[PDB]
């Protein structure tokens, strides 16, 4: 299986490992994950993290061969569980969690979007727009302990972690772009630039 495969101490997980558009497993929803966690599940989520960290260093980024990333969801490993982690810099760290069965508990009315719009790593092919998302969320969410962590987001955190939760529901980030125009500043939509 990916999980037995990746979960390996000696394996790096490498874009290799994370799989693409066609793939059907990106458009299923993932399954919870039970507690306690087995191992398997607590080492996937650590090697995700060290994915996260290596993609976002020059040097290793280049020997690897990895496209940079501030999130990522256990489905786009081919492993169908509610997993995800975060690991976004200071403009060391503004947000770092492996966050299991994540949930946006509560929303704000306003709308945002990132000006720049949203890469994926599942996505070799630029989609232009405004991908729209909450612009605050409450978020629930479990660490490797089965301890509840309760958390509020703004910006871009806030972003980001809707994002990962989207790949465990089965959602990319295009099918929340205007289809009509994919540049469109509705009322009530901040663009964060
Ligand atoms: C289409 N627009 C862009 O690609 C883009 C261009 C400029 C600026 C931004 C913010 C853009 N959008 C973007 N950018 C990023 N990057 C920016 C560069 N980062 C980076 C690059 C090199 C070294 C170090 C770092 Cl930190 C990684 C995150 N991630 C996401 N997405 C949209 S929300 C989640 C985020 C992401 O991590 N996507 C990867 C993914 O598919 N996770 O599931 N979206
Ligand atoms: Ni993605």
Known sequence: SAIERITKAAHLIDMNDIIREGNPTLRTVAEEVTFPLSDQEIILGEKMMQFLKHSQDPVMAEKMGLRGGVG?????????????????????????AIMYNPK???????????????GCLSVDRNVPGYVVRHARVTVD?????????????????????????????????????????????????????
């Not at 997993?83 to 760290?93: E, G, K, Q, R």
């Not at 969410?141 to 939760?165: A, C, P, T």
């Open 72 to 96: 990522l969801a256990a489905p786009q490993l081919d492993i169908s569980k509610r997993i995800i982690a975060v690991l976004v810099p200071n403009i060391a760290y503004d947000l770092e």
């Open 141 to 193: 969410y479990f660490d490797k302990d089965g301890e509840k962590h309760r958390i509020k987001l703004k910006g871009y955190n806030s972003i980001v972690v809707q994002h990962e939760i989207d790949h465990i529901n089965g959602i990319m980030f295009y099918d929340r772009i205007n289809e009509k125009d994919p540049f469109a500043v509705k009322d009530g939509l901040l663009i964060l630039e």
């Open 104 to 118: 946006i508990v509560s929303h704000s009315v306003q709308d945002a979007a990132l000006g720049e719009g949203e």
